[PDB]
Amino acid sequence: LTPLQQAALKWARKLAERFPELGEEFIAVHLEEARFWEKAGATPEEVDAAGKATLEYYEAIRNGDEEKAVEARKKALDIYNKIVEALKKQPPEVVAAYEAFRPRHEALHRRAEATLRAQYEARGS
Ligand SMILES: [Zn+2]
Ligand SMILES: [Zn+2]
């Protein structure tokens, strides 16, 4: 267990615990994403800051806080953009592997956004 994997595990487990509908699948998908971040040369602190902003982002959707959602989304994607451009210099098998994995992360992301917005519209928070 690398320090980068531990950093991704900490924030992905928090999201799964607070929103059980996402489930352990939310943790596993974010670990696989973290393996590509590690391949691209990301550091544990970059993954820790991005995971922290991701929890704040989804917590913002659950609570209807739009300003916090905008700020948290930018903080997470500022770090993600650094890693997309680093992935360009990766071997083609790594890039092709990432392009084949990303639709599964996209589908979990679409589900998580809709499910938490639904909890704000119904439960209210
Ligand atoms: Zn995600
Ligand atoms: Zn989105």
Tokens of 61: 């959707």
For 104, the enclosing helix (H) or strand (E) is helix 92-122
| C-alpha to C-alpha distance for 112 and 109, rounded to whole angstroms | 5
The total domain count for the chain is 1
Tell me, in angstroms, the distance from the centre of ligand 1 to residue 22's CA: 11
Tell me, in angstroms, the distance from the centre of ligand 1 to residue 108's CA: 7
Tell me, in angstroms, the distance from the centre of ligand 1 to residue 5's CA: 15
> Nearest CA to 25 among 14, 35, 12?
12
53 CB contacts (<8 Å, ≥6 apart)? Answer: 72, 73, 75, 76, 79
| C-alpha to C-alpha distance for 76 and 46, rounded to whole angstroms | 9
| C-alpha to C-alpha distance for 69 and 62, rounded to whole angstroms | 10
Largest Cα–Cα distance in the chain? 47
Q: Specify the amino acid at residue 80.
A: Y
Domain that includes residue 47, residue range: 3-122
Tokens of 84: 């997309």
Q: Specify the amino acid at residue 73.
A: R
Resolution (Å units): 2.1
| C-alpha to C-alpha distance for 21 and 3, rounded to whole angstroms | 27
